DNA sequence: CAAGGCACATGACAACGGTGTTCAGTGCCGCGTTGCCCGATACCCCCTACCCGTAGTTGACTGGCATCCGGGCGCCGGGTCGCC
């Protein structure tokens, strides 16, 4: 909590793990795994409770991987925003 | 010389003259205002042209910006860390 909140935002980015090819391809594999898990859960057909909880856990892990990609690439957006700054928008 | 007999005019007499009222009736005609007939018009339709919003675009491309000093001047007031 300081002045010039952009500096605070960069500090909020902090140190996060940059992803090498294997890392993000595996992460996206887990993303589509969670996608299929939630697709199965959304179906009105009855699924066993333990299987439904497992699918929910897989979907949650997928969400975490999404967040990891977001935070890792936060640095990428800040550079792109600088690429367009100084045109009447903050 | 006085009395009796004839002319012209005379006290009224109505009835025309001419015109003024009045009745009483019926209109005459003053303006106000109705019933027409047209021209334009606002209000439905169809058509397409162009504005306005939405959705994509695959080598790679991973942290920015320039601040700010010569007020000046003092005070309040709180915070802030030493102090013994």
From Swiss-Prot:
It comes from the Bacteria. Coiled coil: none annotated. Disulfide bonds: none annotated. Residues 2-90 are annotated as: Binds RNA polymerase-binding protein RbpA. Sigma factors are initiation factors that promote the attachment of RNA polymerase to specific initiation sites and are then released. This sigma factor is the primary sigma factor during exponential growth. Its activity is stimulated by RbpA. Belongs to the sigma-70 factor family. Homotrimer (Potential). interacts transiently with the RNA polymerase core complex. Interacts with RNA polymerase-binding protein RbpA via its sigma-2 region (residues 211-347) in a free form. This is RNA polymerase principal sigma factor HrdB. It comes from Streptomyces coelicolor (strain ATCC BAA-471 / A3(2) / M145).
């Amino acid at each position: 909590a300081t002045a010039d909140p952009v500096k605070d935002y960069l500090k909020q980015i902090g140190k996060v793990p940059l992803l090498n090819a294997e890392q993000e391809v595996e992460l996206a594999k887990r993303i589509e795994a969670g996608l299929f898990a939630e697709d199965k859960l959304a179906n009105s057909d009855k699924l066993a409770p333990k299987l439904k909880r497992e699918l929910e856990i897989i979907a949650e892990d997928g969400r975490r991987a999404k967040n990891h990609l977001l935070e890792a690439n936060l640095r990428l957006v800040v550079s792109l925003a600088k690429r367009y700054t100084g045109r009447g928008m903050l």
